[PDB]
Amino acid sequence: QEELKVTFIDVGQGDAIYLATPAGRHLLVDGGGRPYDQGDFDVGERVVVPFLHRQGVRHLDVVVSTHPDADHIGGLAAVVRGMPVSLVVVPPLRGAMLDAYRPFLAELQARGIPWQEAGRGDALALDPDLNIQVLHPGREISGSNSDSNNNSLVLKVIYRQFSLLLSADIEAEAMADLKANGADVRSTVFKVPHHGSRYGLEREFLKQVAPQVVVIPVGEKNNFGHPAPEILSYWQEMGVPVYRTDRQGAIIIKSDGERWQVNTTI
């Protein structure tokens, strides 16, 4: 019954979220995403794996690759090459999406690392005190299975009264679907999708999340103007503090399931 500790690693314009669970399990959600820095600097080798060593991690129980487009795998390649990984979770892979993932999945097979496709209604049993629910995407052969950002994996991490919604890169169309299907998205902490892009502004969905604080992993002087002013304005309208990795470095959230705290690096 150690506290849950979640670190949003400062990986620039990218997401990498390390969760140390109460029982002592190690979970990594993403590893920096698509290299907009042309990949010459591998954020996985240079930032993520060294971070995990500095936190004392020697193996990861679960690695989650949230995005169905394989050129978003990014630093996760370096993670599975740089330390033992017991399980990789990916979204439902279909069509050309599976195609592009095939080299990564072949490396997993060569390493003996099982992978699991996860979709709406699944859960990642890892720690008996943590409920890790997969809310999105569904598995239906539906319209635009190929709609990449909107079919990224959404996870809700629950420890008693504390919850964290890891929204990956979803946009307003996915948010409307989640709202329409009654997804239980109300959360203590909301990870804003796709670095605060304005295309994640779905007010009915965000009203239901009703977060106490939000976290934006986002890079300084990224090419997209992230986080969008419309997104920052929205959280101001709601009175919700915004934590950002570009301005504040790594963001650390700790909780015993009743009390929780957010701290920053810079």
Residue numbers in the entry: 532 to 797
Paper text:
We determined the 1.8 Å crystal structure of BLACTMg, consisting of the characteristic αβ/βα fold that defines the MBL superfamily. The active site is positioned at one end of a wide shallow groove between the sandwiched central β-sheets. Our structure contains clear density for a phosphate ion in the active site, but lacks coordinated metal ions and thus represents an inactive state. While our structure of BLACTMg does not contain the β-CASP domain, it does display common sequence motifs found in other MBL enzymes, such as the characteristic H-X-H-X-D-H motif (where X is any residue), which consists of H598-X-D600-X-D602-H603 in BLACTMg. BLACTMg contains no bound Mn2+ without specific supplementation of the metal (as captured by our crystal structure), whereas the majority of the molecules in our sample are coordinated with two Mn2+ ions when BLACTMg was incubated with 5 mM MnCl2. The absence of coordinated Mn2+ ions prevents the active site from adopting a fully catalytically competent conformation. Based on the catalytic mechanisms of those family members and structural predictions of BLACTMg coordinated by Mn2+ ions and bound to adenosine monophosphate, we propose that D602, H603, and D600 rotate into the catalytic centre to coordinate metal ions. Taken together, BLACTMg coordinates two Mn2+ in its catalytic centre in order to function as a DNA nuclease. Mutation of most residues involved in metal coordination render BLACTMg virtually inactive in our nuclease activity assay, with the only exception being D600A that showed a ∼5 fold reduction in the apparent initial rate compared to WT.
All competent bacteria require ComEC to transport the transforming DNA across the cytoplasmic membrane. Most ComEC orthologues are comprised of three domains: an OB fold encoded near the N-terminus, a central competence domain consisting of a bundle of transmembrane helices forming a channel and a C-terminal β-lactamase-like domain. In the next step, a single strand of the tDNA is translocated across the cytoplasmic membrane, which is mediated by the putative channel protein ComEC, while the non-translocating strand is degraded. The β-lactamase-like domain of ComEC is a member of the metallo-β-lactamase (MBL) superfamily.
